[PDB]
């Protein structure tokens, strides 16, 4: 139940960057879990609140 404290291991983070047009292909798609994510930069939460 406890909040984790030591940094936990995470699934690899594939970064799709979908455009105006693209040619999608799924040969050599990963089978084990991956975190698909669409945007290049997402450490947007930077204002730490003591």
């Amino acid at each position: 139940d406890d909040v984790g404290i030591m940094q936990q291991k995470k699934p690899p983070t594939v970064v799709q960057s979908r455009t105006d047009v693209f040619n999608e292909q799924f040969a050599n798609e990963a089978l084990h879990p991956t975190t698909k994510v669409i945007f290049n930069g997402l450490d947007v939460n930077t204002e730490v609140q003591p």
């Binding site: 105006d20 945007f39 290049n40």
Partner: protein, 148 residues
């Protein structure tokens, strides 16, 4: 060509309030709570077919933007961003596209940026040889005009 919204999709005005972080099965998912039924949707995958209409991108969390696009992809959302102004160039099939507008920039740009969308006119695309083996892969367009 401006694609129609398929029957059974439901209009939803964007609001910051529609999205929130929340716990969902050992992860802080960016839950989307659909205004009609009120039901939360922690993941993009299960969401109701939604014709979301973003009148103004300003103030939106970038993570909410990624979630909305991920909804367009995994739940087949049709989201209509009205804020954007853009020039368009109708490229010939011979020349192909030269510039690609990432959906990231389309979602996160300041109002008043002037995007330059390209558009192939595929009427003159060459016909494939009758005997040639099939190509692998599928061309996909993500962004569309609302107007001719």
């Amino acid at each position: 060509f401006v694609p129609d919204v398929p029957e059974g999709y439901v209009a939803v005005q964007y609001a910051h309030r529609l999205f929130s972080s929340s716990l969902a099965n050992k992860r802080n998912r960016v839950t989307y709570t659909h205004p009609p039924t009120g039901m939360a949707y922690p993941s993009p995958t299960g969401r109701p077919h939604v014709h979301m209409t973003i009148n103004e991108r300003a103030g939106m969390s970038k993570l909410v933007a990624d979630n909305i696009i991920a909804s367009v992809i995994k739940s087949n959302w049709v989201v209509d961003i009205l804020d954007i102004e853009y020039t368009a160039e109708v490229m010939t099939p011979s020349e192909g596209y030269t510039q690609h507008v990432d959906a990231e920039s389309i979602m996160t740009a300041p109002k008043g940026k002037l995007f330059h969308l390209q558009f192939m006119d595929g009427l003159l695309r060459p016909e494939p040889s009758a005997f040639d083996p099939p190509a692998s892969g599928e061309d996909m367009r993500l962004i569309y005009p609302l107007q001719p």
